[PDB]
Design a protein around this ligand. Structure first.
Ligand SMILES: [Co+2]
Lengths: 132, 15
C-alpha cells in the first residue's frame, strides 16, 4: 500500500534532571513522558501502519544510554504498557475519517541494576514505517 | 529513517 506523509520527523523527550541519590536502588526510574508519532494524508487503500523501532541496546535489553551517565537505560513503551525494545514493531489502524495514523508512545529512564552515575542522558531511536 | 525520537536529560550527583 501507498505511504502516508510523516508529520513527525523529529520528537524530543526531555527527561529533565534525575539525581544519583534517587537512582541508587535497582529499578529506580523517571516518570513516563509521552511522545507521539503522527502520519497524515494516508492514501485510500492504506489502512494499517507498522512502525519498526531501532536503537542501540545494552545487556539489560533496554536502550543504551549514549550520554555519559552510567548504569542508566532508556525504555520505550506503547500506550498500553508494552515494552518496545529495539527490533520491536507496532501496528495501528488508519483512522478513515481523517486518513491519519498515530502512535501514542511513552519513554522513561530507569536504572535496571541501580547506581546511576553523574552525567548526560542522550539516546536516539529510529523509526521506519511500512504500510498495508 | 522516517522519524527519530531523541531522549535527553541529566543525572546529577551533589555528593
Ligand atoms: Co519530566
Amino acid at each position: 500500500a501507498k505511504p502516508c506523509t510523516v508529520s513527525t520527523t523529529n520528537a524530543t523527550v526531555d527527561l529533565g534532571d534525575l539525581y544519583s541519590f534517587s537512582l541508587m536502588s535497582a529499578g529506580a526510574a523517571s516518570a513516563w513522558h509521552d511522545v507521539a508519532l503522527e502520519l497524515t494524508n494516508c492514501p485510500v487503500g492504506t489502512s494499517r501502519v507498522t512502525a519498526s523501532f531501532s536503537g542501540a541496546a545494552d545487556s539489560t535489553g533496554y536502550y543504551k544510554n549514549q550520554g555519559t551517565a552510567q548504569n542508566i537505560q532508556l525504555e520505550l513503551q506503547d500506550d498500553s504498557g508494552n515494552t518496545l525494545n529495539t527490533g520491536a514493531t507496532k501496528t495501528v489502524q488508519v483512522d478513515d475519517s481523517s486518513q491519519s495514523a498515530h502512535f501514542p508512545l511513552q519513554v522513561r529512564a530507569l536504572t535496571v541494576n541501580g547506581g546511576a552515575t553523574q552525567g548526560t542522558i542522550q539516546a536516539v531511536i529510529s523509526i521506519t514505517y511500512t504500510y498495508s | 529513517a522516517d522519524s527519530t525520537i531523541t531522549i535527553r536529560g541529566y543525572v546529577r550527583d551533589n555528593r
